[PDB]
Amino acid sequence: SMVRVAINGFGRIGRNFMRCWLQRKANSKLEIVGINDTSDPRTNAHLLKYDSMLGIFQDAEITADDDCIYAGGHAVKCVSDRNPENLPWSAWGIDLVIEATGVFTSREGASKHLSAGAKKVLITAPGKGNIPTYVVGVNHHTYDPSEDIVSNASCTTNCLAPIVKVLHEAFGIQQGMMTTTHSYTGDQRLLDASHRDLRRARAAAMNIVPTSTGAAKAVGLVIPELQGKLNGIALRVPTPNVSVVDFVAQVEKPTIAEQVNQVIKEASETTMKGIIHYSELELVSSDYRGHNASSILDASLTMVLGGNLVKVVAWYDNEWGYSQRVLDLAEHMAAHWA
Amino acid sequence: SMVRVAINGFGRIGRNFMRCWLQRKANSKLEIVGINDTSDPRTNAHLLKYDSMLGIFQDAEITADDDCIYAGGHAVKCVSDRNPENLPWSAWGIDLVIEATGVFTSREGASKHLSAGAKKVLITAPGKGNIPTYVVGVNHHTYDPSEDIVSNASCTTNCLAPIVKVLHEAFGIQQGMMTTTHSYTGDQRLLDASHRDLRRARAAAMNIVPTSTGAAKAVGLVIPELQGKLNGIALRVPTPNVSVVDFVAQVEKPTIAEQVNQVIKEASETTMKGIIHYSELELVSSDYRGHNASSILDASLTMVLGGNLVKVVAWYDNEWGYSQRVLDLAEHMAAHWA
Amino acid sequence: SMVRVAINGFGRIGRNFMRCWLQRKANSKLEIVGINDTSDPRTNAHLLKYDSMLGIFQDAEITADDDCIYAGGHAVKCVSDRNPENLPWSAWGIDLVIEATGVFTSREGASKHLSAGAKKVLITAPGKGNIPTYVVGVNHHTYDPSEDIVSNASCTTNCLAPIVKVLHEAFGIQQGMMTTTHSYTGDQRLLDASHRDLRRARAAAMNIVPTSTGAAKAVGLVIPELQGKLNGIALRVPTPNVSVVDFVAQVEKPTIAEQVNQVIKEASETTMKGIIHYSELELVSSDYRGHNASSILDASLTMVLGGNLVKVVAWYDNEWGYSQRVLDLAEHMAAHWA
Amino acid sequence: SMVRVAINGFGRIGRNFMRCWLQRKANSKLEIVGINDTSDPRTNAHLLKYDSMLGIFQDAEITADDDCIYAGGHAVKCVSDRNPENLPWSAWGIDLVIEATGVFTSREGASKHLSAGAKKVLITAPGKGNIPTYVVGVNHHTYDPSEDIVSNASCTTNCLAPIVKVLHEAFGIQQGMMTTTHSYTGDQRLLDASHRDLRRARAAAMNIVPTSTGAAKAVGLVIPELQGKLNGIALRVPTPNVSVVDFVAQVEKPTIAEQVNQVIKEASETTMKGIIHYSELELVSSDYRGHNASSILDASLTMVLGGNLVKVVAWYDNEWGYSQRVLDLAEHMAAHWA
Ligand SMILES: NC(=O)c1ccc[n+]([C@@H]2O[C@H](COP(=O)([O-])OP(=O)(O)OC[C@H]3O[C@@H](n4cnc5c(N)ncnc54)[C@H](O)[C@@H]3O)[C@@H](O)[C@H]2O)c1
Ligand SMILES: NC(=O)c1ccc[n+]([C@@H]2O[C@H](COP(=O)([O-])OP(=O)(O)OC[C@H]3O[C@@H](n4cnc5c(N)ncnc54)[C@H](O)[C@@H]3O)[C@@H](O)[C@H]2O)c1
Ligand SMILES: NC(=O)c1ccc[n+]([C@@H]2O[C@H](COP(=O)([O-])OP(=O)(O)OC[C@H]3O[C@@H](n4cnc5c(N)ncnc54)[C@H](O)[C@@H]3O)[C@@H](O)[C@H]2O)c1
Ligand SMILES: NC(=O)c1ccc[n+]([C@@H]2O[C@H](COP(=O)([O-])OP(=O)(O)OC[C@H]3O[C@@H](n4cnc5c(N)ncnc54)[C@H](O)[C@@H]3O)[C@@H](O)[C@H]2O)c1
């Protein structure tokens, strides 16, 4: 029977994850039975239904009362406590917590759900410290059913890793530089305001904002042969969703642009089907909203110089594509449950 | 000698106020000696100098250490405590606190600065309850030197009131409706997220967001004859700064557009000089950045029907113009410090 | 059998109209057989399918060659000539031309399609001079089957007129002021550049840009009792689509907000069904994308002072809603093709 | 005495060039005496003074009549003819034409100014065909005084070339990939509309838009040893001005990030002073508005892997910094006039 899931943090990723599940609900091993968030159920049902990016949820009615959010007859219990130790996970029989607050990414933070009664936690972000990290289509079959806390990495890592994996196997990646031109996120400020990062303090819709990213080093955890070989940065820019990765690799086997493209295309039809999509179309960021792939290779932009310097460019829907992956990782854990 | 001022909340209004004061510092009866804010002095010195809206501060060098921000040799002490009861106002000899956090606008909230030792508080927002409210150029000469807590109203009210006062005295305002088309503010969300107001919850730079405003009722507190005669709404739109008021009045004395324009132009040259600016130019919001007036009447947009229904439109820089008026109100209180 | 329609100008309105028709194609008396536009069929097929605002067209396959656009097997002939006198309207047997270029809105301009062979022209904009103007749900039943050139007015007029008509019949509108806070359009500039209107010359996505509008006077042509009683302005703001009308009326019959709301709700359920939608929800512009109504009354925003000064606020999707009404007007003309 | 200059095309670059000159007018060998543009002098004086990006021109009064634009007593003659063969260049004694329309970048196009009577033309864009290309601080001392038509290259080339030149001399560039994350320009569409490039057809303020750029190949013309070794792309993003270049080079001499930074910093103090600025500050795009350097190296973002794969990141103000360079190239030509 079903794995009972709770969502902790009903934010952009929490609510995209819930909409992904509501559309794949008929063939799932998961049942979302609870949400904890700092707001109330009426606010949250409103935001679940009325989304500036995804539009109005159509498939089922979404309603709320003091206690619950109702999404097409399914009643999802709600609570509101900032400290996960106090959560009613035992009383609700929660198996798996989708940890989407952004604030409990270390083992000590995420463990508080275990001590409140949950059996496992899936963190929708890179882990801090020693937390096993999975990227679906790259290393998710190495999942160890005895792990209690896992990470689904970041959106950028889920875009980059599959492409790196295909290029590494075909050409041998020796070193690699990435830049993601990335939509702003809720971590940034609307107008100039205090922040730990002096660049992310700055009005997000008016600026190109450079920032660091662990995505390129995190690829080394999911593809252990590349540990320490990749580095990169992020530029946040004034769009609200959809991002793009530009990756330049120094490879061992000399090649040309048509061959790099052919290798990716073959992978997108076979071993990376559903993970990498190969696009030959001249599209822009709006067109990739709602796309289900982790990475959409923009084949016209591929270029190679001197045999060994390879550049590829891939799109990702950082909210929705990432949430589809969280859901796939969760379904995978449900099918391998101990 | 000088009135010693502390800023509580070094946000958009706090930092605009500080820049206003640094440029009018030679003519001033105030001396800013302290800042309380939830962030540290190095962050705040960086944000003071580097502003997405105002640009790089040029007049003087701005530096910081653990304890202080230095703005052209002047040392501004810094502290960081969310609870104003704990603040060192007696120890720093603070006379006047500029209350710019947005969070202590009731008498009970603002009184915590008195009990920490400040002699007076000027709230940079409408007051809740019974707090005397002043709009410079409308009723600031009614200020009573024995008042310990005052409000400088909102940006919208400072734009609307002077125009209303001139139109009321010339034509007799019987009723009036206002809509402000207003730049987004820090109160709104960057991407759809929880908020007390379900409209302000929504991505601010992607949406037109209606909201309620007390600006129109607050005009009745500064022009007591009009209490209960005005109402209005706000539409937040995707610009970071500069706003516009549209005001439709039912008046007693029949008139036409040219005459309504002439009455405002006359007032802008005499009794409202420096408060209302009259513009015959066809400008857009960007052109009003840094403008010092509380209201800039856009004269081409004035229209009248049937003698008695009058529409006027006025611009305001909601951050900078408003902060100029906080500074004027403070200088006025300094000059009458009995 | 079918009325053969050609689209002249395959811009935002032309392409929205075509999508409207492709989704209502089974119930239709029209058949779109031709397009004239300044660009070629491959470009136009790409733009028809890939739309930043509407997303990717899903219902049918859309393809092109040198001569034609194919939308689900239906072949739409294409030509590219700036001068409508040269167009092959007789040769293609065109009955009705949808004039959507923005450039042939006078009788003399629009008559060039007649002289090229079309039997009638429907202008997707206000007409200049003496052109009969229809707003569906307000005066479209006065359409006269012998009229050869008609106007569907503007988006703003389609939003404002039905509401005015309901309020006039219930309360007696004596005078009225309108401001539309309107999404930017193709008529404006991306960055400051030359334009007939010095305000529209200015960077559209960075500014609030006031402009004149004939929408309020045009309400007098569709509701002849109100000719000369209404006036208004527009403020263009940095959203790409969806607009809002704010209307302040001086009325004869004293009233209050609840009653004004009840009169509009009643009309939305009966005589204005499908034209006015009544909303009690706290939504923002993004939520009205794709909405089929000409006006969506935002009921919480309704306010009344002194019995006789009434403010209402209504949303409209200026591209899609308006195009639905062009399609309805065209279906109406088809049904009465005497 | 003075070189008499005319501006053909009074667009973003034409008007930025004019403001650069008005501020450096006291030590110049150039005198701007005429403008040709498709609009009239009153429109153009308005746009010259009221700029959404640069703000209100302060230094001098700017006025216009039917014939002329006046900028602080200096009367600049205006004409309006799309075809440069008809221009009054002989009658106005024009020596140098600043060709800023974007439409006369080939030798045959630009020569029409010579045949109207001008002696030289400086194209504010890459040339098509065999036109000598200069980048100030890279190859401008190779100017040949007998050349009648020159190119100042693009904004991206002016940012990239100086940095490439310093890296090549210190490390030996073997191959190099660039991506510029670039503000939208007037070449793009405000809302989805026809364009030769199917990506630039798309709403520029709502999308990340990839496009090709000749900047990386054009570096090979100004640094002839690197011909054919560089390639790259552009991503247009929703900011109106200021751009950033990300450059990844494969170099011969093994190095680390601190050494790459030290070499650039030393060049910025000496041979590239005024061309490259070295910044150690954590700033965002808004902060670089109005910056006079061709390239501002963001030193914190530099990274190196395996000795030979080097990434650097540099900002540029694509309007203003580029126009300063156009002015410097023109002054250089004036000082070497034959
Ligand atoms: N593009 C993306 O948005 C994206 C993609 C991949 C991963 N992520 C990661 O997913 C996580 C969430 O990011 P997001 O974009 O949803 O941010 P968000 O701020 O929209 O969502 C966080 C939610 O958690 C709530 N919250 C905060 N602290 C809480 C607490 N102690 N208890 C309960 N609820 C709490 C917030 O109110 C909000 O509802 C972050 O770790 C982020 O790094 C984001
Ligand atoms: N257009 C405008 O921005 C505008 C105009 C007029 C009035 N106001 C009003 O001015 C006030 C502030 O507006 P803002 O736009 O500057 O907001 P903001 O969020 O930029 O500023 C608030 C500042 O105070 C800090 N803060 C919050 N709680 C605190 C506490 N308990 N102790 C100390 N510091 C705290 C924040 O960290 C921030 O630095 C509000 O009352 C607002 O309504 C704003
Ligand atoms: N919100 C709106 O967009 C809106 C709403 C209602 C009405 N309108 C009106 O509809 C009309 C078009 O608006 P739009 O927003 O679609 O503009 P747009 O610029 O997107 O569309 C015009 C189209 O016609 C083409 N064109 C221009 N001149 C031509 C000629 N001589 N021959 C053939 N084709 C030509 C353009 O290339 C473009 O494809 C205008 O009259 C406008 O006022 C627009
Ligand atoms: N970031 C930048 O804007 C940038 C930087 C470097 C180079 N450039 C180049 O500078 C040139 C101008 O670009 P821009 O951004 O000023 O564009 P723009 O469209 O703002 O300026 C072009 C001007 O020329 C006018 N014009 C067009 N055709 C004409 C003709 N036949 N005769 C006279 N005037 C005519 C236009 O009306 C406009 O005033 C282009 O070649 C562009 O590639 C642009």
DSSP, residue by residue, B78-130: EE--S-GGG--TTTTT--EEEE-SSS--BHHHHHHHHHTT-SEEEESSPPBSS
Q: Which residues have C-beta atoms less than 6 Å from ligand 2? A: A 193-194; B 8-14, 36-38, 82, 100-103, 124-125, 154-155, 185-186, 318-319, 322
Residues C209 and C304 in one domain: yes
The structure was resolved experimentally with: X-ray
Is A306's CB within 8 Å of D174's CB? yes
- Centre of ligand 3 to C-alpha C13, Å, is 6
Residues D167 and D310 reside in one and the same domain: yes
- How far off is chain D from A138, nearest CA to CA, in Å? 24
Residue numbers in the known binding site of D for NADP(+) are 12-13, 38, 82, 124, 318
Q: Are A215 and A267 in contact (CB under 8 A)?
A: no
C9 Cα nearest atom in ligand 3: 24
Kind of pairing between the strands at D173-183 and D230-237: parallel
Identify the CA nearest to B308 among candidates B259, B256, B262.
Answer: B256
Are A167 and A289 part of one and the same domain?
Answer: yes
Assess whether A78 carries a catalytic annotation. no
In sequence order, the 6+-apart residues with CB closer than 8 A to the CB of A151 are: A105, A122, A123, A125, A126, A127, A131, A132, A133, A134
End-to-end CA distance of chain A: 13
| Residue D206 near chain B (CB below 8 Å) | no
Q: What CATH number corresponds to the domain at position C253?
A: 3.30.360.10
Q: How far is C210 from chain D (nearest CA, A)?
A: 15
- Cα D212 to ligand 4 centroid, rounded to whole Å: 18
Residue whose CA lies nearest to ligand 2 atom number 11: B102
Q: At what angle do helices B155-171 and B215-222 cross, to 10 degrees?
A: 60
Residue A22's nearest CA partner among A74, A90, A96 is A74
Residue among A20, A68, A78, A155 flagged as catalytic: A155
What CA–CA distance (Å, rounded) separates C301 from C244?
12
Give, in order, the Cα–Cα distances in Å from D248 to each of A173, A231, D173, D311.
15, 12, 10, 4
* Ligand 4 geometric centre to CA of D110 (Å): 14
CA distance A112 to C299: 45
Whether the CB-CB separation of D86 and D116 falls below 8 Å is answered with yes
Q: Which residues are A243's β-sheet partners?
A: A316
CB A78, CB A69: distance < 8 Å:
yes
Using CB atoms, list chains with 3+ pairs below 8 Å to chain D: A, B, C
Same domain, A160 and A149: no
> Whose alpha carbon is nearest atom 9 of ligand 3?
C125
Cross-sheet strand order for the sheet of C3-8: C62-64, C68-71, C74-79, C30-36, C3-8, C96-99, C120-123, C149-151
- Give residues preceding each break in chain D, C–N over 2.5 A: none
Q: What are the chain B neighbours of D284 within 8 Å (beta carbons)?
A: 52
- The dihedral sign for the CA sequence A156, A159, A165, A166: negative
Query: What's at A112, amino acid-wise?
Result: K
Return the SS3 of C160. Answer: helix
Q: Report which of A329, A307, A327 is spatially closest to residue A21, judged by C-alpha positions.
A: A327
Q: Which of B50, B56, B289 sits opposite D55 (nearest CB)?
A: B289
DSSP A106: B
- Interface contact D285-A239, CB threshold 8 A: no
Minimum CA distance residue for ligand 3 atom 8 = C125
Chain D contact for B283, CB < 8 A?
Answer: yes
Structure tokens at C212: 């004149």
Instruction: State how far the Cα of C291 lies from the Cα of A55, in Å rounded to an integer.
Output: 12
Q: Which residues contact A288 (CB under 8 A, 6 or more apart)?
A: A242, A296, A315, A316, A317
Q: Both A118 and A261 in a single domain?
A: no
Amino acid symbol at C125: A
Question: How far is residue C132's CA from residue C221's CA, in Å, rounded to a whole number?
Answer: 8
Same domain? A52 vs A77? yes
Structure tokens at A288: 């990739």
Domain span at residue C62?
A: 1-153+319-338
- 8 Å CB contact of C283 and A52: no
* Range list of H helices, A29-154: 41-49, 107-116
Q: How far is D164 from chain A (nearest CA, A)?
A: 16
Residues of B assigned a catalytic role: 155
A149/B203 Cα distance (integer angstroms): 32
Chain centre to alpha carbon of residue A255: 31
Whether A240 has its CB under 8 Å from any CB of chain B: the answer is yes
Residue A254: count of CB within 10 angstroms of its CB: 11
- State how far the alpha carbon of D263 is from the alpha carbons of C104, C116, D170, D174, D255, in Å: 62, 70, 7, 18, 11
Residue C267, helix vs strand vs coil:
helix
Place of tokens 């994350």: D181
Please state, in angstroms and rounded to a whole number, the distance separating the CA atoms of residues D247 and D233: 11
CA torsion sign for A59, A61, A62, A68 is negative
Q: For residues A229 and A300, is the Cβ–Cβ distance under 8 A? A: no
Subunits next to B (3 or more Cβ pairs <8 Å) are A, C, D
Using the 8-state DSSP alphabet, how is residue C185 labeled? -
Burial of B60 (0-12, 13-18, 19+ CB in 10 A): middle
Q: Are C41 and C65 in contact (CB under 8 A)?
A: yes
For A262, B249, D190, the CA distances from C258, given in Å and listed in that order, are 66, 22, 41
- Taking the CA atoms of residue D101, residue D107, residue D109 and residue D110 in that order, the dihedral angle to the nearest 10 degrees is 50
CB of B209 closer than 8 Å to CB of B188: yes
Q: How far is A100 from chain B (nearest CA, A)?
A: 13
When computed from its CA atoms, the radius of gyration of chain D, rounded to whole angstroms, is 20
Give the C-alpha distances (Å, rounded to integers) separating D231 from A250, A301, A312, D160, D275: 15, 11, 12, 12, 23
Residue C244, helix vs strand vs coil = strand
CATH number at residue B22: 3.40.50.720
Residues 6+ apart with CB under 8 A from A181: A234, A235, A237, A243, A244, A246, D181, D208, D235, D237
- Can you read off the two tokens belonging to residue B148? 């310990």
CA A102 to centroid of ligand 1, rounded, Å? 5
Give every CB contact of residue C80 below 8 A, 6+ residues apart in sequence.
Answer: C36, C37, C38, C39, C40
Within this chain, do residues D12 and D131 fall inside the same structural domain, yes or no?
Answer: yes
* Residues A86, A36: Cα–Cα separation, whole Å: 11
Q: Of D167, D162, D157, which is closest to residue D309 (Cα–Cα)?
A: D167
Q: Does C283 touch chain A (CB under 8 A)?
A: yes
Instruction: List all residues 6 or more positions away from B86 whose beta carbon is below 8 Å from its beta carbon.
Output: B116
- Residue B193 CA to residue D39 CA, distance in Å, equals 46
Token pair recorded at residue A267:
């992978």
Tell me how close the Cα of B190 comes to any Cα of chain A, in angstroms: 5
How many independent structural domains does chain A possess?
Answer: 2
Instruction: State the first-to-last Cα distance of chain D, in angstroms, to the nearest integer.
Output: 13
What letter does residue C106 receive in the DSSP assignment?
B
Q: Are C126 and C105 in contact (CB under 8 A)?
A: yes
Handedness of CA D298, D302, D308, D309 (dihedral sign): negative
C322 ligand 3 Cβ < 6 A? yes
The answer to whether B183 and B238 have CB atoms below 8 angstroms apart is: no
Say yes or no: D136 and D211 in one domain: no
Q: How many CA atoms lie within 13 A of C98 on its CB side?
A: 36
Contact D190, C188 (CB under 8 A): yes
Contacts of D26-32 with CB under 8 Å at 24 or more apart are D28/D2, D28/D331, D29/D2, D29/D3, D29/D331, D29/D334, D29/D335, D30/D2, D30/D3, D30/D5, D30/D96, D30/D327, D30/D330, D30/D331, D30/D334, D31/D2, D31/D3, D31/D4, D31/D5, D32/D5, D32/D6, D32/D7, D32/D74, D32/D76
Q: Considering only CB atoms, which chain C residues are within 8 Å of A45?
A: none
The catalytic residues of C are 155
Closest ligand to Cα C101: 3
* Amino acid letter, D98: I
Structure tokens at A305: 């110089």
In this structure, the answer to whether residues C139 and C166 fall within a common structural domain is no
| CA–CA dist C13, D135 (Å, integer) | 45
Using CB distances shorter than 6 Å, the residues near ligand 4 are C 193-194; D 8-14, 36-38, 82, 100-103, 124-125, 154-155, 185-186, 318-319, 322
Alpha-carbon gap, residue D120 to A267, rounded angstroms: 55
Among partner residues B52, B286, B290, which is closest to D52 by beta-carbon distance?
B286
Contacts of C59-64 spanning 24+ positions with Cβ under 8 A: C59/C22, C59/C23, C60/C22
Three-class DSSP category at A90: coil
What is the number of alpha carbons within 13 Å of residue C329 lying toward its C-beta? 35
Are the C-beta atoms of residues A170 and A249 closer than 8 Å to each other? no
Annotated binding residues of D: 12-13, 37-38, 82, 115, 124, 154-156, 185, 213-214, 236, 306, 308, 318
CB C311 within 8 A of CB C246: yes
Strands C243-251 and C173-183: antiparallel
Helix (H) or strand (E) holding A315: strand A309-316
Number of B/C CB contacts below 8 angstroms equals 135
The neighbour count for residue C199, using CB atoms within 10 Å, is 20
Q: Are residues D126 and D218 in the same domain?
A: no
Give the HSE-up count for residue A118: Cα atoms under 13 Å, Cβ half-sphere. 28
**3-class SS shares of chain B: helix, strand, coil, % to 5:** 30, 30, 40
Between CA A56 and CA C281 the distance in angstroms is 13
d(CA D209, CA A298): 12
Q: Is residue B88 located within the same domain as residue B63?
A: yes
CB of D102 within 8 Å of a chain C CB? The answer is no
Contacts of C47 (CB under 8 A, 6+ apart): C10, C15, D192, D193, D194, D201
Let me know: does B193 contact A44? Beta carbons within 8 Å.
Answer: no
* Angle CA C6–C12–C17, to nearest 5: 45
> CA gyration radius for chain C?
20
CB atoms near residue A199 (< 10 Å): 21
By C-alpha distance, which of D243, D215, D221, D213 is closest to D138?
D221
Cβ–Cβ gap D52/B283 under 8 Å: no
> Quick one: which ligand is closest to D188's CA?
4
Clarify whether residues C121 and C267 are in a common domain.
Answer: no
